């Protein structure tokens, strides 16, 4: 239920996804996904893999962790790729990458992040928002 406009989705290399809200996507030992500004931070350098075209596996280089969004719209780190773990990578006003969850792209849910480094909830995520706008950097 979503369009096909994909970015370069280059995977060879790891890198960051920079929110237009301010924070780098961080994947934490506990589990505990969020938002962070230091670039430093040894949690934020991600490998992106793909399944089919346009579908992606986030997941922390650190940790080994894959990026997961719950029944209830939660993001969180998961040992194993199930199919939580499985997002949409789209392009988004031509130069920024959204990612969709699958498992609940009938329902809109993105990875977002808050200007206050805290996760969104996939309900209250939509297109138009800044908070699901990524940029991929290199590491």
């Known amino acids: 239920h979503h369009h096909f406009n994909l970015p370069p989705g280059n995977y060879k290399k790891p890198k960051l996804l920079y929110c237009s809200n301010g924070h780098f996507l961080r994947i934490l030992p506990d589990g ?59 392009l988004e006003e031509n130069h920024y990458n959204t990612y969709i969850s699958k498992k609940h792209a009938e329902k809109n849910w993105f990875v977002g992040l808050k200007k206050n480094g805290s996760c969104k909830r996939g309900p209250r995520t939509h297109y138009g928002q800044k908070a699901i706008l990524f940029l991929p950097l290199p590491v």
């Not at 893999?49 to 596996?57: D, H, I, M, P, R």
């Not at 939660?74 to 773990?85: A, D, F, K, V, W």
Request: charged share 25%; glycine share 8%; net charge negative.
């Open 32 to 90: 505990t996904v969020d938002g962070t500004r230091d670039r430093s931070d040894q949690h934020i350098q991600l490998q992106l893999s793909a399944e089919s075209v346009g579908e992606v596996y986030i997941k922390s280089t650190e940790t080994g962790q894959y990026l997961a969004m719950d029944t209830d719209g939660l993001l969180y780190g998961s040992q194993t790729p199930n199919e939580e773990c499985l997002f949409l990578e789209r």
